[PDB]
Structure 1
Amino acid sequence: ATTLKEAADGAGRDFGFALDPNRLSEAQYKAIADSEFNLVVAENAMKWDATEPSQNSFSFGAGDRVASYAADTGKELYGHTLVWHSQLPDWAKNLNGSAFESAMVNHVTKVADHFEGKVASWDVVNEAFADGGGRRQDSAFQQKLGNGYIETAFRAARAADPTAKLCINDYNVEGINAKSNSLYDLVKDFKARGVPLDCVGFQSHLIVGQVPGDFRQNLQRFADLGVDVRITELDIRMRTPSDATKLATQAADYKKVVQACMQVTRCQGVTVWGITDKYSWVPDVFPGEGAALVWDASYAKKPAYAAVMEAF
């Protein structure tokens, strides 16, 4: 109505953001975080590198801060992420066979247990597949453990947390293609055999002017397998600097994404990967690309803001 939180709340869906706990000391950042979202996810604080820097030695300070923030502001807490090929410490990469599998399972158990009852959902496994279909080719988990690591990770997560929503997350799976198809088969297989799995996340790290037209259809087929779906890391990057046309297209793109979710009853909601363009991860990875978020570098609402409110 007046804020995006109000729009999402009124719609009965979630609208979250990727939080960097250190930014909470920046008043403006905190103000927008407090009033514009009803869900929070750690942008980096709950990743392996941030939680288990050395074998069986945990660092929960940053993760705890994110969790405390959600509880203090009354927002849903989304966990990210227990098993991922990236931001994996070297000590883990140096392990093999049973040693590596145990380190993985111990990591999953310790983190899930630590945040049990606080984190409502977990990206148990992140980016297990590859563009073009099949499994990811540069993953330590796939290379050292094979196809069964995903099931192992999920069963371990349920073992630790009996009620948390266990999700599998990925990108380039927004549309119906080889990658999402392989992801589709896995989800169907898991539900078929009783492997703990409750949700599927579609990152949605999109490019301005390029939103899958079959996004809704894709979300629906997964929802129909008996699992919830969610846009987890939404941001739509453009060639910087921005201009009127790019901002208008971006706004329209944000609208399409949110509408596709609104059109699927089991789509829990949408989470944007950050608040302001001044801290977005995009520029540092894509030279000359950026302005992908809802707020600009001066915290002024971009036209994408109105588009999101409308879609909800």
Structure 2
Amino acid sequence: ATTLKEAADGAGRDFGFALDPNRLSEAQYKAIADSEFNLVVAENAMKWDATEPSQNSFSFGAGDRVASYAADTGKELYGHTLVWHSQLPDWAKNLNGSAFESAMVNHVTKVADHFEGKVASWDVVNEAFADGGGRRQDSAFQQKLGNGYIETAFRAARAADPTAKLCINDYNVEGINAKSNSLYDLVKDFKARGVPLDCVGFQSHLIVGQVPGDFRQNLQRFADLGVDVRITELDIRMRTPSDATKLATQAADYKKVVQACMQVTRCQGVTVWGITDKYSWVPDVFPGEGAALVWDASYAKKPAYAAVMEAFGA
């Protein structure tokens, strides 16, 4: 292999990136997108704010651009995300009771129908759980609809799209902890009762030098419930600026994550949350942190690149 795409292809797994379709007009960004990944997810273009800016009025141009990119380059398309407490328009927050439930159901139905046969897998529900266990405490869905909204969303997604893989996705669930235990309980319950659910996403927004040692064990216990697993939003952030020590640790960390996936037969692959440090979401949220991705801000491969290639078995 001479590319990460070749390494993942050869391993029989997915290696994906989060796309901003506006950056396709930057040729260096597009060149790396085209050659280094076999899967694409929309970083933002398929979220609720980007797709349904007023009630039952849809704006699919940006999401269509991502889908067309996937089809034109022969990449798998991953859908992110139907139901999420963040990036939720005010019009939806202003609804309550059955009117809010109906807005959720309609959003799920219209977006899944629109992309049916193009999107292969959906994050149907994103970030439902709380650090420390139990349900998220600042969610319009949890607050307005209670526990049952997750099952409602999954059943509605399956009613719209009979074949797509339907995933639940979360962060800080890479290790075995109260949060991943709550997620595990739900997955086991859904499978037991025949609620549509095919996959679990592990965002893997990690900090340099802090990869959970029980990541593989955790992925495996989920796979053993009868679902696929995936690393969905990988990045590994450090204090900026980078130096040799930090870049070496980061490379080792990327290798640990990709190896954990390789070691679980039903781990579909790894998606990184962007291409270049130039555009990473990290510095805006975490002051003085960054350099989290595989390419630096001038599109040079970082040591993480060779580590990913090695971990895929190339």
CA-CA distance at 1:6 after TM superposition: 0.1
- Work out the CA distance in 1 between the residues paired with 2:190 and 2:234: 26
- Work out the CA distance in 2 between the residues paired with 1:212 and 1:193: 31
- Work out the CA distance in 2 between the residues paired with 1:246 and 1:160: 46
Where 2:111 maps in the other structure, the secondary structure is helix
CA-CA distance at 1:243 after TM superposition: 0.1
CA-CA distance at 1:253 after TM superposition: 0.2
Where 2:206 maps in the other structure, the secondary structure is strand
- Work out the CA distance in 2 between the residues paired with 1:65 and 1:236: 28
- Work out the CA distance in 2 between the residues paired with 1:143 and 1:256: 37
- Work out the CA distance in 2 between the residues paired with 1:126 and 1:5: 27
CA-CA distance at 1:158 after TM superposition: 0.1
Gaps of 5+ in 2: none
Deviations 1:99-120 (A, max 9, x none): 0000000000000000000000
- TM-score normalized by structure 1? 1.00
CA-CA distance at 1:213 after TM superposition: 0.2
CA-CA distance at 1:305 after TM superposition: 0.1
- Work out the CA distance in 1 between the residues paired with 2:75 and 2:164: 16
- Work out the CA distance in 2 between the residues paired with 1:284 and 1:214: 30
Where 1:295 maps in the other structure, the secondary structure is coil
- Work out the CA distance in 2 between the residues paired with 1:247 and 1:59: 40
CA-CA distance at 1:230 after TM superposition: 0.2
- Give the structure 2 partner of residue 286 of structure 1: 286
- Work out the CA distance in 2 between the residues paired with 1:212 and 1:160: 37
- Give the structure 1 partner of residue 12 of structure 2: 12
CA-CA distance at 1:8 after TM superposition: 0.1
CA-CA distance at 1:19 after TM superposition: 0.1
CA-CA distance at 1:64 after TM superposition: 0.1
- Work out the CA distance in 2 between the residues paired with 1:184 and 1:287: 32
CA-CA distance at 1:279 after TM superposition: 0.1
- Work out the CA distance in 1 between the residues paired with 2:281 and 2:129: 22
- TM-score normalized by structure 2? 0.99
CA-CA distance at 1:139 after TM superposition: 0.1
- Work out the CA distance in 2 between the residues paired with 1:280 and 1:24: 15
CA-CA distance at 1:192 after TM superposition: 0.2
Deviations 1:159-179 (A, max 9, x none): 000000000000000000000
Gaps of 5+ in 1: none
Deviations 1:161-212 (A, max 9, x none): 0000000000000000000000000000000000000000000000000000
- Work out the CA distance in 2 between the residues paired with 1:171 and 1:28: 30
- Give the structure 2 partner of residue 310 of structure 1: 310
CA-CA distance at 1:262 after TM superposition: 0.1
Between the aligned residues of both structures, percent identity stands at 100
- Work out the CA distance in 1 between the residues paired with 2:221 and 2:16: 24
- Give the structure 1 partner of residue 212 of structure 2: 212
Deviations 1:117-159 (A, max 9, x none): 0000000000000000000000000000000000000000000
CA-CA distance at 1:59 after TM superposition: 0.1
- Work out the CA distance in 1 between the residues paired with 2:275 and 2:252: 18
- Work out the CA distance in 2 between the residues paired with 1:3 and 1:10: 11
Paired residue total? 312
- Work out the CA distance in 1 between the residues paired with 2:3 and 2:105: 41
CA-CA distance at 1:229 after TM superposition: 0.1
Deviations 1:66-91 (A, max 9, x none): 00000000000000000000000000
- Work out the CA distance in 2 between the residues paired with 1:296 and 1:100: 42
- Work out the CA distance in 2 between the residues paired with 1:101 and 1:182: 23
Deviations 1:252-272 (A, max 9, x none): 000000000000000000000
- Work out the CA distance in 2 between the residues paired with 1:102 and 1:289: 40
CA RMSD of aligned residues (A): 0.1
Indicate yes or no: 2:107 matched with 1:107: yes
CA-CA distance at 1:293 after TM superposition: 0.1
- Work out the CA distance in 1 between the residues paired with 2:182 and 2:200: 13
- Work out the CA distance in 2 between the residues paired with 1:249 and 1:64: 38
CA-CA distance at 1:32 after TM superposition: 0.1
- Work out the CA distance in 2 between the residues paired with 1:171 and 1:207: 13
CA-CA distance at 1:51 after TM superposition: 0.1
Deviations 1:197-248 (A, max 9, x none): 0000000000000000000000000000000000000000000000000000
